[PDB]
Structure formats: C-alpha cells, structure tokens
Design a protein around this ligand. Sequence first.
Ligand SMILES: O=C(NO)c1ccccc1O
Length: 167
Amino acid sequence: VNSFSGYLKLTDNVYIKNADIVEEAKKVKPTVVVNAANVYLKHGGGVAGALNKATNNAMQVESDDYIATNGPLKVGGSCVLSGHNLAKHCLHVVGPNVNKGEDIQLLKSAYENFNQHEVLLAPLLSAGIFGADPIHSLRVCVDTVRTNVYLAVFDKNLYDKLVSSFL
Ligand SMILES: O=C(NO)c1ccccc1O
C-alpha cells in the first residue's frame, strides 16, 4: 500500500491523475519525483521550471554544482539528486526535445531510467514544451516502465484525452 490518492489505474504498474506534480509532490513526499530535465539541468520552464521554483531555486543551485563537476547528461540519461522539500530524491531524466530535433527513439531509453526505482511520481517525458505527442509518451511509458509509476498530468483537457484514447 502507498500514499498516492485519486489515480486511475491504467495497467498492473502505471497509474495516472490530473494533478500539478508540484502540489502532488508537496502532499505525498514521494521517495522519487521525476524532473523533465535537459542535459544542462537548466530548470527554466515546464516541469523543471515549476519544480525548481517550488524549491526556492535550491534545485538549480545543486544542479549547477553537479554540472560543474560531471558535465552534461546524455539525451535519454538521468541523474539522482536531492528532492529538497518535494521528495527524498529527484530523478532528473532527459527525454528528447522535438523542438531541438532529437531522436524520439531516445524516449524509450529515457523511460528505462525509471526501472531503477521501485516507485516514482513522474510527468510524461518529452511532453509539454519538449514537443512530443503525449499519447505516444504514455504508450512508451506503459511499454517500458516495469516499476510502479504515478503519472501527474498538468492539463485536464489532456488528461481526459489520454484516458479516453488509452488502449
Ligand atoms: O508549468 C507548470 N507550471 O506550474 C507545471 C507544473 C506542473 C507540471 C507541469 C508544468 O508545466
């Protein structure tokens, strides 16, 4: 049994809810919240900008030190950093950004990072300002992630379309 409430069950392991991931993290304090990161961990807008704002910029400060030591992530890669006031840990995952021309086949590699964590609160990778089709992102998630994933969908209209169209 876990703390997550009000989710629709899509599969054995994938759950979905219309919710602001920031407000959901603040309520649940999950072991892992996933950030929709870029390779520079520059948390400017969307999931990354909203999560970072909720940490009062502490996520960005920690991220800048990580990049100064380790250099950029790979598209499809991830790193584990602090969850600050939102979660125990933040898994920063880089999905491909279609608005930069990145290979959408890298979306499966991105979701494979989730399998290193038994339970996660996450957004749909490569959705929103990353430019991918969120219906596709949800299909890759279901077909890739084997651990228990609680997906927060920021937009109500999109949430209803994701549920109604789910195979
Ligand atoms: O932009 C946002 N503002 O809150 C946001 C918040 C939660 C999830 C995705 C988002 O884009």
